[PDB]
Amino acid sequence: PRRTVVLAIDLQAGVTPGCFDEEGVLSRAAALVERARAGGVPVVWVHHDPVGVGTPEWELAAPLHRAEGEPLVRKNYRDSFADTTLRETLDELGATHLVITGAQSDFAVRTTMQRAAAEGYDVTLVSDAHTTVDTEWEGVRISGEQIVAHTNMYFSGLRYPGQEFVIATHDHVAL
Amino acid sequence: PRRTVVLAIDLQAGVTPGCFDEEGVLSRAAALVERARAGGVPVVWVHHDPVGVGTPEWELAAPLHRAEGEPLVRKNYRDSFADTTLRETLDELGATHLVITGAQSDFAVRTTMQRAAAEGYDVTLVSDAHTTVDTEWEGVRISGEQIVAHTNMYFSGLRYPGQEFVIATHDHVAL
Ligand SMILES: O=C1N[C@@H]2C=C[C@H]1C2
Numbered sequence: 001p002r003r004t005v006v007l008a009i010d011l012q013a014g015v016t017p018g019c020f021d022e023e024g025v026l027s028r029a030a031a032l033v034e035r036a037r038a039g040g041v042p043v044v045w046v047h048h049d050p051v052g053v054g055t056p057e058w059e060l061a062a063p064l065h066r067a068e069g070e071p072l073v074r075k076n077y078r079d080s081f082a083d084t085t086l087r088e089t090l091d092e093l094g095a096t097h098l099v100i101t102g103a104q105s106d107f108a109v110r111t112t113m114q115r116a117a118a119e120g121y122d123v124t125l126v127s128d129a130h131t132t133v134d135t136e137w138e139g140v141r142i143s144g145e146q147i148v149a150h151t152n153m154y155f156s157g158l159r160y161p162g163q164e165f166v167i168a169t170h171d172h173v174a175l
Numbered sequence: 176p177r178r179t180v181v182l183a184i185d186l187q188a189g190v191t192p193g194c195f196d197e198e199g200v201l202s203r204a205a206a207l208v209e210r211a212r213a214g215g216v217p218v219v220w221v222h223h224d225p226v227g228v229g230t231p232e233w234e235l236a237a238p239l240h241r242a243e244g245e246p247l248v249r250k251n252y253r254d255s256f257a258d259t260t261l262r263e264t265l266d267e268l269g270a271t272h273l274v275i276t277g278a279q280s281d282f283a284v285r286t287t288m289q290r291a292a293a294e295g296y297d298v299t300l301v302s303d304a305h306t307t308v309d310t311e312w313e314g315v316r317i318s319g320e321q322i323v324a325h326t327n328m329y330f331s332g333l334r335y336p337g338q339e340f341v342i343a344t345h346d347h348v349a350l
C-alpha cells in the first residue's frame with residue numbers, strides 16, 4: 001500500500017534568501033503543496049532550529065503557509081531523521097514514498113534524501129523545487145545553479161535493491 | 176575503544192581513468208594504505224561488481240595492491256552497505272571510525288560516507304584522496320575538480336549528535 005507524503009525541508013525565511021532561482025523554487029514548492037492538499041496527500045514540514053527558534057527567520061518563507069493538521073518536525077542537524085520525530089511521524093502516517101522539496105540542496109536536502117533512501121523509502125526528488133547558494137572551496141567556485149543541477153543528476157541515477165527513486169518536476173510528480 | 180579502519184572504495188581500473196587529478200589521487204591513496212599497514216590499521220577494500228566481475232576493469236587501479244588478510248567487499252550499488260558484507264565485516268573488526276578514500280566522489284563515495292554517518296560511525300574523509308569526472312546536467316557543466324571541492328566543503332561541516340567528522344589530507348589523517 002503505497003502512501004505518498006510530501007516532505008518540505010527547511011523552507012525558512014532565514015534560509016532561502018540569496019538562493020539560486022529563489023522566487024521560482026518557492027513558488028513551485030507552494031504549488032506542489034497545494035496540489036498535494038487538493039489530492040489528500042499529507043504534507044510534513046521540517047524546520048532547522050539553529051536558524052533561530054522563536055525568530056522570524058525560523059518561520060516559513062513567503063508565500064508558504066502551513067495548514068491545520070500538517071505535522072511539523074524540528075531538527076538541529078542536516079539529517080531530518082537525526083534525533084527528531086520524523087520517523088515516528090512518517091510511521092504514524094504509514095508513509096512509504098517521500099516526495100522531497102526544500103533547501104538547501106547540498107545540505108539538509110542532500111542529507112535527508114539520502115538518509116531516507118538508506119531507511120528504505122521510495123523517494124521522489126522534485127527537480128525544480130530545491131535550491132541553495134553559490135559557494136567556493138579549495139580555490140574553485142561552484143554556483144548554486146551547478147549544485148542544483150548536479151544534485152538532480154545524482155538523484156536521477158540513484159538505486160537501492162527493492163526501492164524506487166524518481167526525479168520529476170513539481171507539476172509532473174505523481175501524488 | 177576507537178578502532179580506525181581505512182575504507183578504500185571502488186578504486187578500480189575501469190573507474191578511475193579520466194578522473195580529475197587521477198595520478199595524484201591514486202598515489203596518495205596508495206601512500207595512505209601503506210601508512211595504515213605500517214601502523215597496524217586495517218584496510219577494507221570495496222569493489223563495484225557492475226564494473227564487470229572477472230574483467231581487468233574490475234581489479235584495482237595501479238599502483239594499488241591488496242595485502243594478505245585485508246577484507247574485500249563486493250557491491251552492486253553506490254551505497255557500500257547496501258546488500259553487502261560491509262557492516263558484518265566492520266563489526267567483526269570492531270570498527271568505530273572509518274577513514275574514507277576512493278571513487279567516485281559524487282557516487283559511491285558520497286553515498287557510502289553519508290550512509291556510514293547515518294549508521295553512527297565517526298568518519299574521516301581524506302580530502303586529497305577521492306575523485307570523479309567532469310559532468311553536465313540541465314545545461315550546466317560541473318568539473319570533477321568542482322565536485323571534489325564541493326564534496327570536501329560539505330563534509331567539513333557535517334554533524335551528527337555524538338559523532339565526529341573530520342576532513343584531512345592523506346598525510347595528516349590520524350591513524
Ligand atoms: O540545508 C540546510 N538547511 C538548514 C540551513 C542550512 C542547512 C541547515
Ligand SMILES: O=C1N[C@@H]2C=C[C@H]1C2
Nearest residue numbers: 185223278279282283
Ligand atoms: O562512484 C562509483 N563507483 C562505481 C562506478 C560508478 C559509481 C559506482
